[PDB]
């Protein structure tokens, strides 16, 4: 049917000559983390400040995510690192996130 072919042969939203598309491709190439412009955000939010169980689950989850080489191209941890952990955490400490390139 028409919709099957339409979802098969989908085209990118932005042109190849878009300055932002060129920028994202070059950023991914230089930093060696994929030639895409797509990226997701895995947020994990809790009723109480995230502690060590959340950190263990997060480590295991990013270990799982990095294994899927075909879909997950890269991810910026920023929370398993004590130097940058507060950049990936709320002021109240109840939420954290990680960006994953697709």
């Amino acid at each position: 049917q028409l919709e099957t072919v339409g979802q098969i042969q989908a085209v990118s939203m932005s042109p190849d000559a878009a300055p932002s598309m060129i920028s994202m491709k070059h950023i991914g190439k230089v930093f060696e983390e994929g030639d895409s412009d797509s990226a997701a955000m895995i947020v994990l939010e809790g009723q109480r400040p995230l502690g060590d169980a959340a950190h263990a689950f997060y480590d295991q989850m990013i270990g799982r995510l990095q294994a899927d080489t075909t879909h997950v191209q890269s991810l910026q941890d920023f929370w398993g690192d004590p130097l940058t952990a507060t950049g990936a955490q709320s002021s109240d400490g109840k939420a954290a996130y990680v960006q994953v390139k697709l």
């Binding site: 932002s20 920028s23 994202m24 950023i27 930093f31 412009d37 955000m41 690192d81 130097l83 996130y97």
Partner: protein
């Protein structure tokens, strides 16, 4: 009525609020802001290894110049690894009766003064620095990237007008520095 037509690019305003993506959007807006999940990334690519104390001054200059744009909040750089300046880098720590100087330094850290910055060159061989140095600087050190967040809606008319201002600020921060003439790339959703 035509010369009053305003448009919008935020696609989550035109979708039911019971989609899982919107559920997580709300979960994130409950804790950081609505613009934390749509960050911009600015990359300055030079022609030399920028992993030295001399070029990190220009990197902090670029970070501050981008942070000084009006609708910008939470610029995140290597000299600013959580949108907050690194402690023990302000002017009362380049200077180093000691109960006075310690009070001065710890008053300059309780406000994140950010008027001066050094990072001595023994931070590049510190193992607790490389895992964050790999996130922000190219593996050969020739490029550095900054992660920028907006204050309100990134995909509004103001958040889209902020892109040229971010690029201009980054270009004016490297003017007259050894990083002058570097290529500036800005990606993201806005």
């Amino acid at each position: 009525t035509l010369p009053g037509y305003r448009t919008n690019y935020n696609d989550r305003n035109y979708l039911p609020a019971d989609l899982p993506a919107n559920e997580g959007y709300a979960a994130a807006e409950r804790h950081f802001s609505q613009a934390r999940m749509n960050p911009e990334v600015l990359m300055v690519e030079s022609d030399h290894d920028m992993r030295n104390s001399a070029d990190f001054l220009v990197i902090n200059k670029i970070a501050k110049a981008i942070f000084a744009v009006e609708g910008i909040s939470r610029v995140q750089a290597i000299t600013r690894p959580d949108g907050k300046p690194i402690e023990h880098t302000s002017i009362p720590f380049l200077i180093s009766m000691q109960e006075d100087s310690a009070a001065m330094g710890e008053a300059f850290d309780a406000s994140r003064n950010d008027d001066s910055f050094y990072l001595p060159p023994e931070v590049f061989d510190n193992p607790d620095f490389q895992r964050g140095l790999e996130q922000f600087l190219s593996p050969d050190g020739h490029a550095v990237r900054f992660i920028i967040s907006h204050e309100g809606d990134p995909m509004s008319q103001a958040g889209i007008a902020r892109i040229a201002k971010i690029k201009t600020a980054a270009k004016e921060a490297i003017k007259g520095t050894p990083l002058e003439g570097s290529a500036i790339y800005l990606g993201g959703t806005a």
